[PDB]
């Protein structure tokens, strides 16, 4: 017979760019009438992401992040400003400052970072027989050099615990990885593919700084991917910094709650498309790690949703080989409901990574 | 007994919904006129020396500026027997149907 | 048209036992939330009763 | 809320921000109301500014956070004249004020008459306190 | 259909008392995920301050269980206090029997529990912390007399296994995670160190050798974990005035699973700030332990539940919204609850707190 | 709708032939869990005896598939047997193809399973053991021709980055098990030890280099793990007395599944004590992996069964029960058997154990 509804609505669009730019509007609103997994409630939350191009010389951008939220009446905030630019094909450099802030605690922080991706193996015969390789095993390979001015009570008490922890236990190099990925975030380290290897503490050093001590932290990481993981297989394609030749912005925000959550989601930025052979452009991949991510998260109620997506292609294009199939077009953009779709959002609301590629040329 | 409750004669709009409350054995709730009753001149107190801590004041939730507070033993002052949880609010408006944002 | 409703109220229910509606709030205080939300429905029901009462009772019929 | 929706002569104050605002916590403040709670004094001279919310719920002290979202018209801190850390005679000074314009019918309002003080900060004094016409800090002076 | 069942009630107490009757029933028309059925299971934990001068109580648990016809059984009998805020120490003996089989153990284990960080500025901010990270350090010192044949080879073919495979430290926790409890462990964000074996040793006992055993070992949790995140929310000894009981049971045969539970125990109520008091926080650990097996059948759900408030206590904020307030007794059925009972039951760890003051 | 058509059929044999005829058809109306689509695979098992004076076994499995419109078919033939009861060995050859690339390769392993108890408390006590932990110590010597230029590049950059990096024996896991079958490892409670390799050299080959990898590992399990647990009953060598055959298969699309599996082999039904056969107990490994991908679609199961036995051998004790006999054969539908097939599809591992006789 029937089962528990508890139905969701969601609402995606998509507005190609012509010529050969993969620039593309990205929006989705979304609302779920079921309790989001999250132990404290209400949890609000307000995302903007922007970028700008700093100078096309050496490819550096100014990448700005504001993550305002507030968990149960506690108003938490925490803004990031950064300088990234691949220095080469494997390796990426960023330079910025942040601060982090929950109730009254507030802390800023200035970081130079390095970042460099190896994959396993770079073999001629799967780039030459696999025209979409989705899985790519390989490593990253973080050293980030971070400096925090120890001007509240509790930042030096933080301080004192920390060189006082490294120095007498010799397990702090990967009992660090239990602190560091709070909660459910650890048990999704292993359900995305994702290995952390133990972090090397090349020193903390204490000097005065502009206004007082700061605390200085040089550390290395290494986290490793099964092909699974996005940041690492696909790592040249989330970056498209030769490509952005306008700032993007990516504001989103949702509002979980006790018996529900509403998503706001609106993009503005390159590679939304990518090529496929022949002046035929597809749709990006779909990224591994947040639809594995949600669905162990979005599978404890049972759900009907129903789910339309709008993809407006460029004058002059049409959509070839879009599977599952669009329900409807209006001569230049296409639509998606119900039908194989709405069983492909449920697949991947859940967590499946059943592969739902546009393809369209002019 | 300990959690005072007090009245904060700068909210107070003087309703005596905290007066209905307070037990007739101790007159701990009061009236101070001080001019026309119109104005917000009647304003009430709590005569600290005759409270007794019922709660009963403060947990029957009807003082609608939030004069009476109920601080604490220790040093928290309380506004009212339960706050919302200070939400962060947003209009979800959908993209092509139910609404069309624009 | 009692057989004719009897065959669509029939089919309506099988349908919302399939598959149920949500207006999801008034499930948890459905002694108020759903009670007042059918107080409203009823009396705009009964004014549209009033009126058909008007219109019909003046009728040849 | 819009000026144009909102009555008249409504300063930024009063205006507040978070258009659904009212349900977003106790309706009666339209920003977060603080209360200065406990300033004790402890190994140096320096006292401890203990700033717990109208709900009651955490026990928060000034902090530069918290001091650039009261400037920035956020939240709001009050005294609460009945504090015992007060530093002023504060039962002479409301009984001697109210007997300027209360009469006591019944002996005894203008004795239990307790009000909240507003704290602003300026910068180069701290959180400070401006009561009878004189601008008191709470680093020292007010307590 | 598999529809599920359940009826859930909590009696407290007022005051400064945190006590609390927890008795729920349930019934589920589903396959238990359990690859030996019918599996049937019995277990009672009674806990009685022995010495209320320094933190002694008895806790005695006894596991009674049949499974695919065997019966099984483990009492445990274990003083335990605290020494310190941290560190907790357990002295007792118990007995384990499986079919005819059946040793006796005796232990004296401390266990120490400690958090990476105890940050005021956290602490101050977050009114009601559930993730919390740490490790716990367990030194066990575990005696069992060598009397069966069977013992005896278990002890010769593990003193051999230690001084021949150098990698027993590691390679113990594939054998003492039976089937799908090494998967469980990082399902709930648990990681166990290797463990490391200060002695193995037998001597002349009372009648005959014994075994004993002095191991060591620690296991660290990223915040759901709440033997770490909550050390002294779960072992509410100061509060035990009396004598506390629980009795708990299923019975699970091929097509259902028919639980059962009582409780008398401190600790159900704890104060949340501003005089109000709340249900203590849902631990994590068994939900997202229940998850992986609540989530192979599509199932509905007339989930019930009683809250008897004490004389004059109201709930403010129940959030899944309570059906029916009733005196001072609540109720919770339908709609939100019924979705979180489900949401809980597949795997969610959603907050469902009942704030509630005089 | 989603729904999930599935018959399926076991044909057994009389005396102590524990063979089985066994087949399946399903239909699942959901998109896979496939991130390149569409996928195919066409499976062809083949098993022969060749001289079971010594345990020889020649078996041969074929893969061929269609992901993306690239082709793949991989080629293994081993010659397999028990030398102990706790080791094998094989000496085979296949290869590999994707597109045009393709290398074909030979092999000499060397596989020994080690339980981590022997008690014969619990052999007794329990009348059917499913949890056994122990570790599996793989030892491999492949020796692969390096004839096209991807072959050689893939040799000297392997050959570089062992010599190179340090930690190759354990990021050679996070290589090796490719997208999720890395948390399918963790799923099944399976660990990977670091690789040990005991060298990498090449020869003048017949017709061109052979880089010989000469590397072992070892595997363990928390008793999940069937190629652990079920070491002996896995590999039925004894009872093989004719050629095997299993020809399986899945068609899947954006938009479905069809899955096409025939298979005719030893051991189908194993022995329960006293005359009584019973189905093998199901393997777990498959269930707890197809959960990871059988929980993303709601789906509505009518699910059939059909247990044919031989003349005169009846049914007892089958949970869920069967529906309807024909005094030859039994089958399963609908009703608790549907709650069954919904749990082993999402994952479930309950006991369904159907004990025939005689
Ligand atoms: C997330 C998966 C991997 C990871 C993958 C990457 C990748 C990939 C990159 C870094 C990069 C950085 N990482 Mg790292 N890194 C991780 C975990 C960490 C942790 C930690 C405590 O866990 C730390 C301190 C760091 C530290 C850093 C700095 C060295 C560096 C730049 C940070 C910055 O600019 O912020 C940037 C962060 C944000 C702007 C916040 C939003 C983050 C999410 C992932 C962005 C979503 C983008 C959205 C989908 C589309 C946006 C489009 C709009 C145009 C913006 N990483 C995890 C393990 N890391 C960058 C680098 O190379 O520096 C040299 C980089 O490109
Ligand atoms: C990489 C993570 C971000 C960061 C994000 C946060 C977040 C998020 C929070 C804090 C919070 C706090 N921060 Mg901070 N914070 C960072 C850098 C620092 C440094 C430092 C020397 O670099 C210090 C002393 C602090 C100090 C403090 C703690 C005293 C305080 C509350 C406890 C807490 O959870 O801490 C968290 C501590 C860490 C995540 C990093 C601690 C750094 C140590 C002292 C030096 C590095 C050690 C090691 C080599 C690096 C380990 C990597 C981390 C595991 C990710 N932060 C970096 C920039 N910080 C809390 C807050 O703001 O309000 C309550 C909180 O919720
Ligand atoms: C078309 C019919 C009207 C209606 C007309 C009445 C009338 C008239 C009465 C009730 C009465 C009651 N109705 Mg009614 N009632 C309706 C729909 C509802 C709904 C709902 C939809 O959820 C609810 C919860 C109730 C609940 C109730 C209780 C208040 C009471 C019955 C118990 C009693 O004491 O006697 N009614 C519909 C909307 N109901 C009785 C009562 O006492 O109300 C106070 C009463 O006299
Ligand atoms: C379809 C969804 C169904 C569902 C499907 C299932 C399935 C399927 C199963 C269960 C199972 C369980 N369900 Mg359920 N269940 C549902 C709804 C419910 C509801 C309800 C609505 O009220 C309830 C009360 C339950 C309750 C239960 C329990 C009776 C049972 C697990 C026993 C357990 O805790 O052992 C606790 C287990 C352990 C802790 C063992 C620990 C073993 C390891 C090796 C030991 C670790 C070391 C140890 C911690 C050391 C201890 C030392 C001391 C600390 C000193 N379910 C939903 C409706 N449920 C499972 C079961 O048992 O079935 C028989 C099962 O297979
Ligand atoms: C379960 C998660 C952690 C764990 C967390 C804890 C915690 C937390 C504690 C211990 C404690 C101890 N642990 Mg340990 N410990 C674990 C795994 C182990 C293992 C093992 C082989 O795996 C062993 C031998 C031990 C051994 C020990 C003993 C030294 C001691 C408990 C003896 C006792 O109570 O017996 C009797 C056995 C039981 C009562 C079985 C019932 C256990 C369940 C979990 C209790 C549920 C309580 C129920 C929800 C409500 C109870 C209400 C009733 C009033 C009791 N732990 C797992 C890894 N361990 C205790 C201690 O401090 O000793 C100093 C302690 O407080
Ligand atoms: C913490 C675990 C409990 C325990 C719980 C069980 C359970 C449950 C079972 C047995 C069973 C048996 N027990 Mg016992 N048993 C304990 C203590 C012992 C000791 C000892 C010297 O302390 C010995 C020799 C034995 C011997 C035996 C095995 C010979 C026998 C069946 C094999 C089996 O799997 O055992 C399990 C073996 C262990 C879990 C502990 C083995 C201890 C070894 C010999 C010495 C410690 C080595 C190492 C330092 C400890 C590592 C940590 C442990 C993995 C927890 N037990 C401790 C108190 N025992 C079976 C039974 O009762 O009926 C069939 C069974 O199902
Ligand atoms: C909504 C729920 C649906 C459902 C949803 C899905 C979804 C969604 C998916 C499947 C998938 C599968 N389902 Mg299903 N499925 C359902 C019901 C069924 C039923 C039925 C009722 O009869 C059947 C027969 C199946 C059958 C199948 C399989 C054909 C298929 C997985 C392929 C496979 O196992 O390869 C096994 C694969 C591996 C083992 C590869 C391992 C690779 C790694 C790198 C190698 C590891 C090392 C290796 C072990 C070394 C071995 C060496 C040798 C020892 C020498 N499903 C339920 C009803 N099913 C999956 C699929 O493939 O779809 C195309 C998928 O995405
Ligand atoms: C799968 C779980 C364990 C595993 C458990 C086993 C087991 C168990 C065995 C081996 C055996 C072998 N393993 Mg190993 N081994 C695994 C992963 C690997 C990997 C790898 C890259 O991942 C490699 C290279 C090897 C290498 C090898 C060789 C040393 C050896 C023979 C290969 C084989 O027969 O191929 C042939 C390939 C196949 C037949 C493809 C089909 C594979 C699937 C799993 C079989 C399903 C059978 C089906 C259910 C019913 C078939 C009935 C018909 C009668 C055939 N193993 C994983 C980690 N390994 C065998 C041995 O002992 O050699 C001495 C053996 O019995
Ligand atoms: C057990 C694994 C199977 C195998 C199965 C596959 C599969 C599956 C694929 C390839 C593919 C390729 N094979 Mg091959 N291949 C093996 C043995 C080899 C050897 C060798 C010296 O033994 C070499 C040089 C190669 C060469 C090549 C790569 C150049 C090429 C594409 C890269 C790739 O992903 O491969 C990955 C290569 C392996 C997983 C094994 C690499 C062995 C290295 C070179 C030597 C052993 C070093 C180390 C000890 C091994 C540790 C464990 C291994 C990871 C299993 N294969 C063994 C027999 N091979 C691709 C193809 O055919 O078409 C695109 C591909 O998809
Ligand atoms: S209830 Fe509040 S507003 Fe009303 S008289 Fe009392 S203190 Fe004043
Ligand atoms: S606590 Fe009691 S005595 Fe005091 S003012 Fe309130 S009702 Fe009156």
Same mark, same amino acid.
């Not at chain 3, 999801?24 to 009670?35: P, T, V």
């Given at each position: 017979?029937?089962?528990?509804?508890?139905?969701?609505?969601?609402?995606?669009?998509?507005?190609?760019?012509?010529?050969?730019?993969?620039?593309?509007? +990205?929006?989705?609103?979304?609302?779920?009438?079921?309790?989001?997994?999250?132990?404290?409630?209400?949890?609000?939350?307000? +995302?903007?992401?922007?970028?700008?191009? $700093?100078?096309?010389?050496?490819?550096?951008?100014?990448?700005?992040?504001?993550?305002?939220?507030?968990?149960?009446?506690?108003?938490?905030?925490?803004?990031?400003?950064?300088?990234?630019?691949?220095?080469?094909?494997?390796?990426?450099?960023?330079?910025?400052?942040?601060?982090?802030?929950?109730?009254?605690?507030?802390?800023?922080?200035?970081?130079?970072?390095?970042?460099?991706?190896?994959?396993?193996?770079?073999?001629?015969?799967?780039?030459?027989?696999?025209?979409?390789?989705?899985?790519?095993?390989?490593?990253?390979?973080?050293?980030?050099?971070?400096?925090?001015?120890?001007?509240?009570?509790?930042?030096?008490?933080?301080?004192?615990?920390?060189?006082?922890?490294?120095?007498?236990?010799?397990?702090?190099?990967?009992?660090?990885?239990?602190?560091?990925?709070?909660?459910?975030?650890?048990?999704? $380290?292993?359900?995305?593919?994702?290995?952390?290897?133990?972090?090397?503490?090349?020193?903390?050093?204490?000097?005065?700084?502009?206004?007082?001590?700061?605390?200085?932290?040089?550390?290395?990481?290494?986290?490793?991917?099964?092909?699974?993981?996005?940041?690492?297989?696909?790592?040249?394609? $989330?970056?498209?910094?030769?490509?952005?030749?306008?700032?993007?912005?990516?504001?989103?925000?949702?509002?979980?709650?006790?018996?529900?959550?509403? +998503?706001?989601?609106?993009?503005?930025?390159?590679?939304?498309?990518?090529?496929?052979?022949?002046?035929?452009?597809?749709?990006?991949?779909?990224?591994?790690?947040? $639809?594995?991510?949600?669905?162990?998260?979005?599978?404890?109620?049972?759900?009907?949703?129903?789910?339309?997506?709008?993809?407006?292609?460029?004058?002059?294009?049409?959509?070839?080989?879009?599977?599952?199939?669009?329900?409807?077009?209006?001569?230049?953009?296409?639509?998606?409901?119900?039908?194989?779709?709405?069983?492909?959002?449920?697949?991947?609301?859940?967590?499946?990574?059943?592969?739902?590629?546009?393809?369209?040329?002019? | 007994?300990?959690?005072?409750?007090?009245?904060?004669?700068?909210?107070?709009?003087?309703?005596?919904?905290?007066?209905?409350?307070?037990?007739?054995?101790?007159?701990?709730?009061?009236?101070?006129?001080?001019?026309?009753?119109?104005?917000?001149?009647?304003?009430?107190?709590?005569?600290?020396?005759?409270?007794?801590?019922?709660?009963?004041?403060?947990?029957?939730?009807?003082?609608?500026?939030?004069?009476?507070?109920?601080?604490?033993?220790?040093?928290?002052?309380?506004?009212?027997?339960?706050?919302?949880?200070?939400?962060?609010?947003?209009?979800?408006?959908?993209?092509?149907?139910?609404?069309?944002?624009? | 048209?009692?057989?004719?409703?009897?065959?669509?109220?029939?089919?309506?229910?099988?349908?919302?036992?399939?598959?149920?509606?949500?207006?999801?709030?008034?499930?948890?205080?459905?002694?108020?939330?759903?009670?007042?939300?059918?107080?409203?429905?009823?009396?705009?029901?009964?004014?549209?009763?009033?009126?058909?009462?008007?219109?019909?009772?003046?009728?040849?019929? | 809320?819009?000026?144009?929706?909102?009555?008249?002569?409504?300063?930024?104050?009063?205006?507040?921000?978070?258009?659904?605002?009212?349900?977003?916590? =106790?309706?009666?403040?339209?920003?977060?109301?603080?209360?200065?709670?406990?300033?004790?004094?402890?190994?140096?001279?320096?006292?401890?500014?203990?700033?717990?919310?109208?709900?009651?719920?955490?026990?928060?002290?000034?902090?530069?956070?918290?001091?650039?979202?009261?400037?920035?018209?956020?939240?709001?801190?009050?005294?609460?004249?009945?504090?015992?850390?007060?530093?002023?005679?504060? =039962?002479?000074?409301?009984?001697?004020?109210? =007997?300027?314009?209360?009469?006591?019918?019944?002996?005894?309002?203008?004795?239990?008459?307790?009000?909240?003080?507003?704290?602003?900060?300026?910068?180069?004094?701290?959180?400070?306190?401006?009561?009878?016409?004189?601008?008191?800090?709470?680093?020292?002076?007010?307590?």
């Amino acid at each position: 017979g029937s089962n528990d509804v508890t139905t969701a609505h969601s609402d995606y669009e998509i507005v190609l760019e012509g010529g050969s730019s993969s620039w593309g509007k +990205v929006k989705a609103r979304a609302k779920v009438n079921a309790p989001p997994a999250s132990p404290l409630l209400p949890a609000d939350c307000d +995302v903007k992401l922007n970028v700008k191009p $700093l100078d096309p010389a050496k490819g550096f951008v100014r990448i700005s992040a504001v993550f305002e939220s507030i968990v149960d009446s506690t108003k938490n905030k925490l803004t990031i400003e950064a300088d990234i630019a691949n220095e080469t094909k494997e390796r990426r450099i960023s330079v910025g400052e942040g601060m982090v802030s929950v109730g009254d605690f507030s802390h800023t922080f200035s970081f130079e970072g390095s970042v460099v991706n190896l994959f396993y193996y770079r073999s001629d015969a799967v780039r030459r027989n696999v025209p979409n390789p989705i899985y790519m095993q390989g490593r990253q390979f973080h050293d980030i050099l971070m400096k925090v001015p120890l001007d509240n009570n509790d930042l030096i008490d933080t301080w004192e615990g920390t060189v006082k922890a490294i120095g007498s236990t010799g397990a702090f190099n990967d009992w660090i990885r239990d602190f560091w990925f709070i909660g459910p975030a650890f048990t999704a $380290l292993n359900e995305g593919g994702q290995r952390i290897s133990r972090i090397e503490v090349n020193g903390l050093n204490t000097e005065s700084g502009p206004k007082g001590p700061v605390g200085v932290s040089r550390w290395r990481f290494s986290h490793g991917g099964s092909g699974m993981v996005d940041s690492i297989s696909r790592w040249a394609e $989330l970056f498209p910094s030769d490509k952005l030749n306008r700032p993007a912005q990516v504001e989103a925000g949702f509002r979980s709650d006790s018996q529900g959550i509403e +998503v706001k989601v609106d993009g503005e930025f390159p590679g939304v498309s990518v090529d496929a052979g022949g002046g035929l452009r597809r749709i990006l991949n779909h990224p591994l790690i947040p $639809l594995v991510h949600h669905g162990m998260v979005g599978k404890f109620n049972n759900f009907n949703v129903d789910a339309q997506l709008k993809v407006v292609l460029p004058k002059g294009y049409k959509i070839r080989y879009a599977a599952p199939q669009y329900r409807s077009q209006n001569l230049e953009e296409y639509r998606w409901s119900g039908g194989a779709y709405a069983r492909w959002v449920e697949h991947v609301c859940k967590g499946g990574v059943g592969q739902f590629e546009i393809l369209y040329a002019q | 007994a300990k959690k005072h409750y007090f009245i904060i004669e700068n909210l107070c709009v003087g309703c005596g919904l905290c007066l209905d409350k307070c037990p007739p054995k101790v007159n701990a709730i009061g009236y101070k006129f001080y001019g026309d009753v119109q104005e917000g001149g009647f304003r009430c107190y709590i005569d600290q020396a005759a409270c007794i801590s019922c709660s009963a004041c403060f947990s029957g939730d009807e003082c609608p500026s939030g004069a009476l507070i109920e601080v604490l033993p220790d040093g928290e002052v309380l506004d009212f027997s339960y706050t919302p949880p200070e939400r962060l609010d947003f209009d979800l408006r959908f993209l092509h149907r139910f609404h069309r944002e624009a | 048209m009692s057989f004719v409703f009897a065959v669509i109220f029939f089919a309506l229910g099988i349908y919302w036992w399939n598959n149920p509606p949500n207006a999801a709030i008034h499930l948890n205080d459905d002694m108020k939330a759903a009670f007042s939300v059918h107080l409203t429905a009823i009396g705009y029901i009964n004014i549209a009763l009033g009126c058909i009462a008007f219109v019909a009772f003046q009728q040849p019929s | 809320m819009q000026p144009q929706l909102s009555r008249p002569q409504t300063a930024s104050n009063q205006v507040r921000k978070a258009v659904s605002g009212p349900w977003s916590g =106790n309706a009666v403040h339209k920003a977060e109301k603080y209360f200065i709670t406990s300033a004790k004094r402890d190994r140096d001279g320096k006292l401890q500014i203990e700033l717990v919310p109208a709900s009651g719920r955490r026990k928060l002290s000034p902090t530069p956070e918290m001091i650039r979202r009261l400037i920035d018209g956020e939240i709001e801190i009050y005294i609460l004249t009945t504090q015992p850390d007060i530093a002023i005679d504060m =039962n002479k000074e409301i009984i001697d004020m109210e =007997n300027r314009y209360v009469i006591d019918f019944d002996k005894r309002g203008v004795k239990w008459t307790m009000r909240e003080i507003p704290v602003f900060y300026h910068e180069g004094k701290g959180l400070c306190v401006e009561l009878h016409n004189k601008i008191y800090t709470l680093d020292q002076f007010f307590k």
